[PDB]
A paper describes a structure:
Like other single-motif type 1 and 4 CISDs, the 53-residue type 3 PcCISD also adopts a dimeric structure with each subunit binding a [2Fe-2S] cluster. The dimerization buries a surface area of 705 Å2 for each monomer. Each subunit comprises four β-strands (β1 to β4) and one α-helix (α1) arranged in the order β1-β2-β3-α1-β4. The iron-sulfur binding module is located between β3 and α1 and coordinates a [2Fe-2S] cluster with residues Cys25, Cys27, Cys36 and His40. The β-strands from one subunit form an antiparallel four-stranded β-sheet that further associates with its counterpart from the other subunit into an intermolecular β-sandwich. The PcCISD structure closely resembles the RsCISD structure, but displays a permutated topology. The two structures are superimposable by both subunits with a root mean square deviation (rmsd) of 0.562 Å over 83 Cα pairs. They also share similar dimer interfaces, including buried arginine residues and water molecules between the two iron-sulfur binding modules. The β3 and β4 strands of RsCISD are replaced by a short disordered loop in the PcCISD structure; nevertheless, the position of the strand β3 of RsCISD is occupied by the C-terminal β4 strand of PcCISD coming from the opposite direction. Another difference between the two structures is that the β-sandwich of RsCISD contains the subunit-swapped β-strands β3 and β4, but there is no strand swapping in the PcCISD structure.
Residue numbers in the entry:
A (entry chain A), B (entry chain A): 3 to 17, 21 to 59
Write the structure that this text describes.
Amino acid sequence: VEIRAIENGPYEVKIAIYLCRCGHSGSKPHCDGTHAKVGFKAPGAKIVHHHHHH
Amino acid sequence: VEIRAIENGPYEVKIAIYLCRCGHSGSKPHCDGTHAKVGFKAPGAKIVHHHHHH
Ligand code: FES
Ligand code: FES
């Protein structure tokens, strides 16, 4: 399981789904690209990289 | 691994961390409670409940 924040965009959750973090998606909790229109800014970040066996 | 959206609040990721989804945390990507001050609204939702062995 990998979770990262995309720069100026959604969370990517890979087990891929994209979760809104700007607050303005028309289809919460899934990102629909509204982040770009509202001018959301936040840097990329690694958040979790979990192997269940470790 | 469990990921859920909290009503009017953050994503909860349990392997617990809380990820901002309103866009306005002072400590992105982590929730700091700003969602309540800005009046963010979104319902609760189950998103993933993954067992690596299944
Ligand atoms: S982060 Fe993409 S619509 Fe909100
Ligand atoms: S969801 Fe809590 S500060 Fe944004």
